[PDB]
């Protein structure tokens with residue numbers, strides 16, 4: 001049981017994602033206009049996948065002004081007021097030196113919590129944290145920020161987002 005939808009990209013056909021807002025069920029991908037060299041978002045079928053058969057790959061070619069100018073946001077995330085949740089996701093990168101922040105917030109852009117400038121390695125690792133829905137929201141969001149300068153020239157892979165009571 002999880003709060004989010006399509007946490008492992010298994011719903012989505014393999015291929016480059018061109019419809020960023022609606023091409024991946026359960027997710028909203030977004031690239032801001034300050035990112036002059038846009039990234040490539042791809043759902044990959046690979047036996048490397050920690051969950052199922054598929055992962056999301058984000059190839060970063062350039063950045064903008066804020067880390068969220070390249071982001072993948074899980075939406076909707078169905079929760080209950082006052083409840084504490086565990087967030088877990090798996091991530092790795094093509095090259096050394098990647099940086100990602102894993103966040104959760106409300107539709108008002110208020111963050112309930114995050115894992116900040118996580119050090120992503122060339123091997124799959126789990127990244128986990130707890131957060132509490134400290135207000136009266138029931139439908140929240142989980143933005144992952146990839147727009148760090150250190151990621152230029154890298155591909156970041158994510159899989160198996162699970163937000164659990």
Ligand SMILES: O[C@@H]1[C@@H](O)[C@H](O[C@@H]2CO[C@@H](O[C@@H]3CO[C@@H](O[C@@H]4CO[C@@H](O)[C@H](O)[C@H]4O)[C@H](O)[C@H]3O)[C@H](O)[C@H]2O)OC[C@H]1O
Pocket residue numbers: 068071073103105109110111114115116143
């Ligand atoms: O989808 C996008 C949303 O993600 C975005 O939300 C804003 C994201 O930035 C937020 O502010 C961040 C909060 O984290 C600060 O870093 C802290 C440093 O200390 C660490 O201990 C702690 O874990 C970190 O949280 C960072 O300085 C600051 O910039 C902001 O509050 C959110 O509103 O909004 C735009 C959406 O498109």
Ligand SMILES: [Ca+2]
Pocket residue numbers: 007008009010049050051052053054055159160
């Ligand atoms: Ca998967």
Ligand SMILES: [Ca+2]
Pocket residue numbers: 021022023024025026027028029075
């Ligand atoms: Ca969407």
